[PDB]
Each structure stands twice: as C-alpha cells, then as structure tokens.
Design a protein around this ligand. Structure first.
Ligand SMILES: *[C@@H]1O[C@H](CO)[C@@H](O[C@@H]2O[C@H](CO)[C@@H](O[C@@H]3O[C@H](CO)[C@@H](O)[C@H](O)[C@@H]3O)[C@H](O)[C@H]2NC(C)=O)[C@H](O)[C@H]1NC(C)=O
Ligand code: LGC
Ligand code: ZN
Length: 752
C-alpha cells in the first residue's frame, strides 16, 4: 500500500449528483512530439466550443471544432501519434445534422453517470452520425482502412428515431487499437425502416463490446478481416448482425431478443481469387429469445467447407431455426434448448491430417472452471470507468512532477507516485510521453488511467543488452496478489533497446475477485512513432540501421504466478512508420511478442501480437488460458534474416523448435487447459516481396504444439501458409484441405 494512506481506496467518494470525474479533473495533457506542445489542447469539452446540448440548437459544427482544434491529422495525412484529442461530452442532447468526422487518434467520451444523447436531426444527411473514415470524390478516403488505428467512442445514446429515411449511427471502418464501449443505439421499429446501428465495410480489427441496439432494420453491418466482440445486445431488430465478409471473428456473450434473423452470414467462394464472404464465426455464450433464425447462411454447404461456424453454449427460447440456409433447408433445428457444441466446417483430431466435414454436434468444448464466472460463462469485464469516483480520488502524475515531455527522465517522479499513492488514489497519467531509464514497478493494488495518449517509454543502458533482458514495466512484485487495473496506457521503448521486456506481468487476482488484474485500451506500440529512434530515418527496410533498430527483447511476459484479463491489447512491433508521412515500411527487431508461463486464469480477449522474430505468442508450461480471438502477423523482412537473427538463441525465452525461416504465430509447450476460440494467424511476405500471397506459400508452418499439451483450437484461420497446424514442427494440417476464400480455416482441432 502507498505511503499516504492507511487502507486501500476501494470505492468512489462522488455524490451521485456530481458530474462524471473526467469533466472537472485538472486538464494537463501534453502531445510531447507535437509541433506546439505548449499550445495544443489534448482535452476538449464540446461545450467550450459552443455546443448547447439542448436538443434544438444544431451542435454539429461546435462538436466538430472540439474534434478539429489544434491542426490535427485530416485529409492528406496517413496517420499520427502526435495530434491526440479527448473530445468530452457533458450530459445533454446534442442535435447533429451531418457526420461528426472522428479524426485519427480521437476519443469521443460521454459523461458515464448520465449518458449524453447524439440526436440525428430529421434532415440528417451523410454516411453515419459518427464517421471514422470519410470518403472523398473518386472513392479516396482520409485513411487506409487497414491503417486506421486509435479511435474510441464511449458512453453515448445514439438516437436515429427522428430520421424518416435511412440513417446509420457509426461508420466504424477501423483496425486495431480501437474500441466502442457502452453505447445504446435507439432506432425506429417501424415496418420497413432503414435504420442501421453500425456500418462496417472493411478493416483489420479490433475489439468492441458493451453495446445495446434497440430497433432498426440492421443492428450492425460488419465486414472486416477479424474482430472480437463482447457483450452486445440486439432487441427488436430485423437483422441483428448483417455480416458481409471476414476471415474470422469471435462473438462472446451475445443476446438477441425479438429479431427476425440473428446472424445473417454471407457465404462466398473457397478460392483466394474468387468472391469473399464470411469465412468464419466462432460464437460463445449467446442468449437468443423469440427470434426466427439464430444464424442464417446465404447459401448451402455441399459436403466440403465453404464458410465455417462454431457455436458454444447457445441458449435458445422460442427460436425455430438454430442454423438455416436463406430460403434453403434448416441445418440445425432450434426450439427451447441449449446448444453445447456445434460446428460446420472441417474437424481434426491428433496428428492425422484428415478433414472431417461436419454440420453437427461436436465433442463438448472444455471450458476450465477458473475461466468461468459464477453463472458459468467466460468472464466479461468492461473497461473500468470509475463512475462513482470524484476528481480528488485521482492523483495527477503531472502534479507530482512527471513532465511527460518526452525528454526529461521521469523515472524518479513516477517511482515516487507509486511509492506514495498506489492503492491510495487512482493514478492518472495525463497525456504525454514519459521517459524512463529503470524498471517501473506497478505495485499490486494499483489502478492506473491514461488520457488518450499517455506513454511510458523505456530507454538507455538498462534495456540495451539482449543477454541480460530487463523489464520496463513490472505489473506487481513476483508472488503478489491484488487489484491491478490499467486503462488507456501505451508501453513502449526508445531504441535501441535489445534487452527490453516491455511488460512483465506478475500480479494474480486476489482470492474471489476474477479479472481484478487486467488491462483495457492498453497497447504496446513498439517503434514507428515520432522521436522513438525507431522510424524510417533510422531503420529502412534495407536493414542498413543494423543494431540501432533493436526495439525490444519481449513485448509481454506473463509469469508463473500471474493472472491477467487482457482486452484489446495490441503488441505491435511496427511494420511501418506512423509519423514520418507516407506510411513508410521499416525493419525493427523484436525477439518475441507474448510469452506466457502463467498457471492462469488468463483471458486474452481480442489481443493481437505482430511482427516479432521468434513467435507472436509462446505458451510455455502455461495453464487455464482462454484466448479469443487472437490475431498475428509475421515480420515483413523474414526470411531475411531467419529466426532467431539478429538475436541469438535464448533457452529461457525461445521455443525448443525455432521457426524455420519464419516466426511461429503460436507455439505451445507443456501447457494444459488452453482454449483458443477464434484465431487469425497471417503471413503476407517473403523478404518484403508479396509474390507468395497468390500461391499461398509465404511460410511453411505457423502453429506448433508439442505431444503433451492439453490445448484445443476452434475456428483457426491462417493466411498464406502451407501447413496451418503442426505437432513437433512437422506439418499435420495442410491448407489445401481447408481453403475458405482468401483465408484457410480449421473449424476444430483436438488431441483426441
Ligand atoms: C454489457 O454492457 C452493458 C452496456 O454497458 C452493461 O450494462 C450496464 O451496466 C452498468 C454496471 O452495472 C449499469 O449501471 C448500474 O445502474 C444501477 C441502477 O440502474 C446502479 O445500481 C449501479 O451502481 C450501476 O451504475 C448500467 O445501467 C448498464 N447500462 C446499460 C445501458 O444497460 C452490462 O454491464 C454489460 N454486461 C456484461 C456481462 O459485461
Ligand atoms: O493488416 C495490417 O495492416 C497494417 C498494414 O497497413 C499493419 O500495420 C498491421 O500490423 C496489420 O495487422
Ligand atoms: Zn477509462
């Protein structure tokens, strides 16, 4: 416990009529590498910019000034980490008449005690009320969709009910490090209405969750490579979810009430050169009441894989058809019953490479009990917002001497904040980049909250030696136990840093509090950013930067005694430079992404690990992990060089079987109770050349398990890899058995 208090802060001291803490907290954020750090406002209350919030004044332009202010990344800008914005909305109804354009690196945040309403005016015109990627003449857009990172919308009512024609709440054409949190969509239930909650046509996501859709023709149109979605509720919709295409997604905790169709799944072809539909859906813990068809496919499957589905723990009350083909036959009859485990697609057992095409119940999926809440469902825990906490329950790191200016060594000031306040106050990292040169231990008991772009950047000799790797952030002491919640933080390095273990996670849940230790909207954005030493000017794809371009030793280390509930975390070794303009590719060296030795419980919900040399995920003597969806990519420069280079073999942190030519997406040794429910593991290059994408042979193997591990894979999608699944570095499941569009999919694998 911190030295300023006698027992832990365990609840807020706000009076219920007080505005949400974020409005009145001192606003001290800096954009460190902005052209004008001293004049550039990070926080913007929409009312300070003229918003009335009275339902009659058109507030579109006032809100837009709150977004736009400071000269930010708009038309003609690829990406930015240096022009952040927290757009804050106090209670009110804000009438808008054209799209609010949510620029690169913007968070829209409503009062969380009293959700503000965004009210579409009856003459609303435009693609959606909130627009994350505007279209320009010629079908250009502000941003490349696969590059459209850093965006959040939290705590709104979105009310389309005054629009008599079509209306869309959010054009959410986004990729990783984005979330939608705590939003209610109010839509017409009139016959023939054309209301749509979300329109999403492409992207490379992503996490979103905790939304309620009331009414509408379509709750969400979703088209995107991959996404994890937690705790959405669809009431009185025509189609809850109109899924138009994907490689593979995971849906957890879905509720569909009084809808015509729940999931409307567009089926496509099986070749990488044909029409792309929905490759894979993995749905776990769904409740469905008074709905005609729970899941409908656009077309039938004739005895081979052509669109994959996994269902786990589906509770149906008055749902005639569980799975059916559009104007085709019923595939699984419903009624009032609980579906335990059911799949459509190719099911595999052991080291036998034989597909069993399945449209039927499958062996019951093991769900280790430690991973399940007290209603028996995968734990579901939303981003903590501290709604009943008052501003004085927070302590500001800027107020305690941490400069956040990206230059001053902030190690001591930060260390001191933890020593004085851990467990005493919520620790508020005002926006900024905080340079540290020694381990920052976050003690068990701590709650940490950032402000859109609050970065801890480790640098210097403690972190440069791969033979002696050292932690930049330590989450709890070894053996420790307690609440640790981290929200809106970035953990990174200033290169070179070949010895950086960016996050070492030790803390375990206390007895009887599940997911009390976890991170939300918290990422490891490794290189590719302003003044990181790891940009295109230091690290060209030629490899000319050499030993300067070591970015880290390991991104995230989950240790033996730890538990972690990790939601949306992107462990991104930068493939390209976000800040120099041009999205230029760069070659950076990370030895590995995520290594877990944790005995559990570990929930990894829509985490991604990308561009590390030896593996994106390594589970070594781990137990009791629920992983879904997990997304990877191999570093673009491989096989030049081959793993482990430019590192050397390390027997503590590397797998026994090193990747041959290319990194493992996931490699598992001596582990049990591991459930991977939804995976997208990709390989797009051979030494910067894309030629291997067409013949689908960019790398040879990508997923390894040993002989003994107790691990199960469901909806395992890989891209451009010959062997999709290996036991003891020998290919077992060949891609040629599972083509499913652009990507290839294993519906189920189990040892037996
Ligand atoms: C799934 O997401 C929804 C949408 O965010 C979550 O529902 C929300 O839950 C919060 C926290 O329990 C509710 O607030 C509570 O209100 C009661 C009185 O109404 C008060 O006694 C509490 O102190 C608390 O503030 C909130 O109303 C509710 N929001 C909506 C629109 O329903 C839900 O928690 C999520 N479920 C899971 C499993 O994550
Ligand atoms: O698909 C992607 O798009 C990006 C390429 O623009 C890359 O930065 C991400 O790491 C990758 O997931
Ligand atoms: Zn928060």
């Amino acid at each position: 416990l911190g030295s300023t208090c006698s027992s832990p802060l365990t609840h807020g001291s706000a009076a219920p009529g007080d505005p949400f803490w974020l409005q009145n907290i001192q606003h001290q954020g800096i954009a460190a590498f902005n052209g004008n750090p001293g004049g550039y406002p990070v926080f913007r209350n929409v009312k300070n910019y003229g918003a009335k919030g009275d339902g009659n004044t058109d507030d579109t332009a006032a809100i837009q000034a709150a977004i736009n202010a400071g000269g930010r990344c708009g038309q003609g800008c690829d990406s930015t980490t240096t022009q952040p914005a927290l757009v804050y909305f106090p209670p009110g109804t804000y009438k808008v008449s054209s799209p609010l354009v949510v620029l690169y690196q913007t968070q829209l945040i409503g009062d969380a005690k009293n959700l503000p309403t965004l009210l579409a005016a009856p003459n609303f015109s435009g693609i959606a009320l909130i627009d994350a990627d505007p279209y320009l003449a010629g079908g250009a857009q502000y941003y490349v969709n696969q590059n459209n990172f850093f965006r959040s919308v939290r705590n709104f009512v979105i009310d389309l009910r005054q629009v008599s024609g079509s209306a869309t709440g959010i054009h959410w054409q986004v990729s990783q490090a984005t979330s939608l949190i705590n939003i209610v969509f109010q839509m017409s239930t009139a016959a023939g209405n054309q209301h749509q909650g979300i329109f999403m046509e492409n992207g490379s996501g992503g996490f979103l969750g905790d939304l309620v859709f009331n009414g509408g023709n379509i709750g969400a149109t979703f088209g995107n490579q991959q996404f994890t979605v937690r705790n959405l509720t669809f009431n009185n919709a025509n189609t809850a979810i109109n899924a138009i295409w994907n490689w593979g997604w995971t849906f957890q905790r879905i509720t569909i009430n009084n809808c015509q169709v729940g999931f409307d799944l567009t089926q496509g072809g099986t070749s990488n050169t044909g029409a792309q539909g929905v490759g894979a859906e993995a749905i776990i813990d769904a409740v469905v009441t008074n709905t005609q068809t729970f899941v409908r496919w656009s077309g039938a499957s004739s005895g081979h894989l052509q669109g994959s589905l996994v269902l786990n723990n589906i509770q149906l009350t008055n749902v005639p058809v569980a799975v059916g083909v559009k104007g085709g036959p019923t595939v699984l009859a419903g009624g009032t019953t609980t579906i335990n485990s059911w799949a459509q697609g190719n099911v595999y057992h052991g080291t036998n490479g034989n597909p069993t095409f399945t449209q039927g119940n499958i062996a019951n999926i093991n769900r280790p009990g430690v991973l399940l809440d007290s209603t028996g469902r995968i734990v579901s825990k939303s981003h903590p917002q501290y709604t009943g906490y008052a501003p004085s329950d927070f302590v500001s790191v800027r107020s305690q001497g941490a400069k956040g200016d990206g230059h001053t060594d902030d190690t001591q000031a930060i260390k001191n904040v933890f020593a004085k306040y851990a467990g005493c106050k919520i620790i508020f990292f005002d926006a900024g980049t905080y340079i540290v040169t020694d381990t920052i231990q976050i003690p068990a008991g701590t709650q940490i909250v950032g402000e859109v772009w609050s970065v801890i950047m480790g640098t210097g000799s403690k972190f440069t030696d791969y033979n002696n790797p050292q932690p930049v952030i330590q989450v709890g002491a070894p053996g420790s136990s307690g609440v640790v919640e981290i929200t809106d933080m970035i953990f990174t390095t200033r290169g070179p840093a070949a010895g950086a273990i960016i996050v070492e996670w030790n803390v375990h849940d206390p007895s009887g509090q599940q997911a009390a230790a976890g991170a939300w909207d918290t990422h490891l954005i490794i290189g590719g950013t302003a003044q990181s030493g790891l940009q295109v000017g230091q690290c060209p794809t030629s490899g000319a930067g050499g030993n300067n371009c070591f970015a880290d030793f390991l991104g995230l280390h989950l240790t033996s005694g730890s538990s972690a509930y990790l939601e949306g975390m992107w462990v991104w070794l930068a493939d390209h430079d976000l800040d120099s303009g041009g999205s230029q590719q760069i070659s950076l060296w990370s030895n590995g992404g995520i290594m877990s030795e944790s005995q559990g419980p570990v929930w990894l919900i829509g985490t991604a690990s990308e561009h590390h040399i030896n593996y994106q995920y390594f589970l070594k003597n781990a137990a009791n992990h629920y992983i879904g969806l997990a997304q990877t990519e191999t570093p673009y420069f491989q096989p030049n060089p081959n793993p482990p280079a430019p590192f050397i073999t390390n027997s503590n942190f590397d797998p026994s079987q090193l990747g041959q030519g290319d990194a493992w997406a996931m490699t598992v040794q001596n582990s049990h109770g591991i459930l991977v429910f939804g995976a997208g593991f990709y390989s797009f290059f051979s030494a910067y050349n894309t030629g291997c994408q067409s013949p689908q042979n960019c790398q040879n193997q990508i997923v390894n398990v040993d002989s003994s591990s107790d691990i199960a894979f469901y909806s395992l999608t890989t891209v451009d890899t010959t062997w999709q699944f290996s036991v003891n570095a020998q290919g077992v499941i060949n891609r040629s058995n599972n083509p499913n569009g652009f990507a290839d999919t294993i519906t189920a694998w189990t040892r037996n």
